Amino acid sequence: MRYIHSEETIPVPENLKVSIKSRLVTVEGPRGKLQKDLSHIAVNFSVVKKGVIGLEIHHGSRKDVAALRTVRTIINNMIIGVTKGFKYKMRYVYAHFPINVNVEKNAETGCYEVEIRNFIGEKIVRKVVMAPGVEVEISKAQKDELILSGNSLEAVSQSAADIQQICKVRNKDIRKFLDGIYVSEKGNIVE
RNA sequence: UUUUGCGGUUGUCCGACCGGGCAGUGCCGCGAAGCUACCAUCUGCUGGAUAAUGGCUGAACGCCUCUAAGUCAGAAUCCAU
Ligand SMILES: [Mg+2]
Ligand SMILES: [Mg+2]
Ligand SMILES: [Mg+2]
Ligand SMILES: [Mg+2]
Ligand SMILES: [Mg+2]
Ligand SMILES: [Mg+2]
Ligand SMILES: [Mg+2]
Ligand SMILES: [Mg+2]
Ligand SMILES: [Mg+2]
């Protein structure tokens, strides 16, 4: 079965502008500007009301229609990141060896870099470089916590995933050795 | 080891000495050059794409989900240097 029409709508709040050209979505607001190339999906964009973007697929199958809500959610995520931002909080956990974390912004590039030392008591220092536009800081509110903030949820979550994956225990009972850096809270910078 | 280079030495022959011949390299010691020995010495690189897996975002399926669109990492693998 091919559905004649599949429709979805995105409301755009008053403080931001959205431009779609050749399926390249650009969202600009108070916190900055984001871009996303959606040319790999056959979707029809339009303006259905004063501040509502309609996106539809015509004569699509189940596989094609499954991407409509994905595109909506992605563009909505871009909008909320542009307006309120995204903030991930990670917690260090360990049994015996305190995990040492040092974060600094590069001079020659705008990216932040995080070095992890004393993981499970081994001498190798593991260095992970954040995606551009993502800021990392040591939490001043409470101990053993990292704060990653940014405009793009994809970049923020990918940097957090990189930090989480770089700290793994090998050839051990993972049910017993729980040491690592794990994302604890996902939210927005504002409110 | 035919450098038949030097020395020693058996038998025989050149009358003796000296210096040599022959015994298909007489035999023995040392023996440079050349060849040669994990029997000696020197030297043997890092980029990309991935598989299994671990993930991000995220529908299908108002929830979920590494997957369906997209995407990160990743093997003595594969393709290059
Ligand atoms: Mg064991
Ligand atoms: Mg000889
Ligand atoms: Mg001689
Ligand atoms: Mg003689
Ligand atoms: Mg004769
Ligand atoms: Mg003989
Ligand atoms: Mg010799
Ligand atoms: Mg998810
Ligand atoms: Mg895919």
Explain what the structure shows:
With 191 residues, this protein is an alpha+beta fold. Helix content is 18%, strand content 42%. The chain is built from 2 helices and 13 strands. The strands form 4 sheets. It has a 4-stranded antiparallel sheet, covered by helices on one side. Strand 5 and strand 6 form a beta hairpin. The longest helix has 22 residues. The chain binds one RNA strand of 81 nucleotides through helix 1 and helix 2.
SSE arrangement, N to C: EEEEEEHEEEEEEHE
Provide the gyration radius in Å: 21 Å
Compute the separation of the termini in Å.
Answer: 44 Å
Helix content: 10-25%
Tally of separate helices: 2
Approximate shape: elongated
Biggest β-sheet description: 4 strands, antiparallel
How much strand? Answer: 35-45%
Q: Which compounds are bound in this model?
A: magnesium ion
Which sequence of strands runs across the widest sheet? 11-12-7-13
The counted number of beta strands is: 13
**Helix/strand structural class:** alpha+beta
InterPro entries: Ribosomal_uL6-like, Ribosomal_uL6-like_a/b-dom_sf, Ribosomal_uL6_a/b-dom, Ribosomal_uL6_CS2
Domain Large ribosomal subunit protein uL6 alpha-beta: 16-85, 97-180
Family: Belongs to the universal ribosomal protein uL6 family.
GO molecular function: rRNA binding; structural constituent of ribosome
